C-alpha cells in the first residue's frame, strides 16, 4: 500500500507535468482560431442559430466530464455535485436536463441514481485526444441544431428531439494546488462587443463563419477535456499523498 500509493503519487506528478505540457501545447491553436472567429464575426451578420438563443427553452444538453479511473479522491464527487447544482438551476429555469457523460465513474453514479444518459464516451479521461473532443462536440452540436424545429414535446419536421442549450461541467485547473468544478455554457453563445488593411475572405465571410463556429465549439470542448485531465491528475496526486500519509 504505502509503496503502491507513493509510486502512484510520483507517477501522478509526472502525469501532471505531461498534462500541463499538453494544455500549453493546444493554446496557440485556440488563440488563433479565436482571433479568426472574432475577425469573421466582426465582418459578418450574427444570425447563426448557434449564436442566438431560442424562445421558451425547455431542454438543456449537459456534459459531465469525469474520470475513468477512480483513485482520484473527490474529483468525481465535486464534478457530480456541480452537475446536481446545474440540474437544479435548469429545473428552476424550467428546462429538462439532457445528460451526456464522459468517463466510467459518472456513468456508475448516474446509473445508481437511475437518471438517463443519452450518450457516453469513456476510456480517454486520463489522456483525451482531439478526435474524442471532435466526436463529443459534433454529437452535442447536432443535438442542439436539431432543437430548433423541435417544439414543445414535438420534434417537428426533424423527428429528433434536440436541446436548447449546451453546458459543460468540468474541473478547471487553476493551479498545481487549486482545482474547481464549474459549469460553463457553450451554446447558444453570446456576442460580446469589444470597442477596439482588411482581411479578404474566401468565398464570403458568412460561409466561413458558419463553418468555423462548430470547430470553435470543438476546440473549446477539447480545452475543457485537457483541463479536466490535468485537474484529475492533480487530484490523484493529492489523494495518493494523503493515502501514503495514511
Amino acid at each position: 500500500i504505502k509503496k503502491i500509493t507513493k509510486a502512484q503519487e510520483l507517477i501522478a506528478t509526472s502525469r501532471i507535468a505531461k498534462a500541463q505540457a499538453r494544455v500549453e501545447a493546444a493554446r496557440p491553436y485556440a488563440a488563433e482560431i479565436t482571433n479568426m472567429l472574432t475577425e469573421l464575426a466582426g465582418a459578418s451578420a450574427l444570425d447563426h442559430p448557434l449564436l442566438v438563443e431560442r424562445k421558451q427553452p425547455k431542454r438543456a444538453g449537459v456534459l459531465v466530464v469525469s474520470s475513468d479511473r477512480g483513485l482520484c479522491g473527490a474529483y468525481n464527487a465535486n464534478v457530480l455535485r456541480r452537475a446536481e447544482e446545474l440540474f437544479s438551476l435548469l429545473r428552476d429555469e424550467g428546462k429538462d436536463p439532457v445528460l451526456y457523460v464522459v468517463g466510467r465513474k459518472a456513468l456508475g453514479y448516474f446509473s445508481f441514481r437511475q437518471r438517463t444518459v443519452v450518450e457516453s464516451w469513456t476510456g480517454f479521461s486520463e489522456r483525451p485526444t482531439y478526435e474524442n473532443a471532435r466526436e463529443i462536440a459534433d454529437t452535442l452540436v447536432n443535438a442542439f441544431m436539431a432543437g430548433a424545429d423541435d417544439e414543445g414535446d414535438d420534434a417537428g419536421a426533424d423527428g429528433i428531439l434536440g436541446v436548447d442549450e449546451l453546458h459543460i461541467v468540468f474541473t478547471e485547473f487553476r493551479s498545481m494546488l487549486s482545482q474547481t468544478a464549474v459549469a460553463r455554457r457553450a451554446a447558444p453563445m453570446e456576442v460580446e462587443y469589444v470597442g477596439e488593411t482588411l482581411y479578404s475572405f474566401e468565398p464570403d465571410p458568412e460561409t466561413l463563419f458558419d463553418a468555423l463556429l462548430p470547430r470553435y465549439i470543438a476546440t473549446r470542448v477539447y480545452a475543457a477535456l485537457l483541463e479536466a485531465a490535468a485537474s484529475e491528475s492533480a487530484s490523484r496526486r493529492r489523494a495518493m499523498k494523503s493515502a501514503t500519509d495514511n
Binding site: 464575426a41 446545474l86 453563445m189 460580446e192 462587443y193
Partner: peptide
C-alpha cells in the same frame, strides 16, 4: 456563478 461562453467582436456596442 455560471460562466457563459462568448465570441468577442471588435466593434462598438450597438
Amino acid at each position: 456563478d455560471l460562466e457563459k461562453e462568448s465570441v468577442k467582436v471588435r466593434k462598438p456596442a450597438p
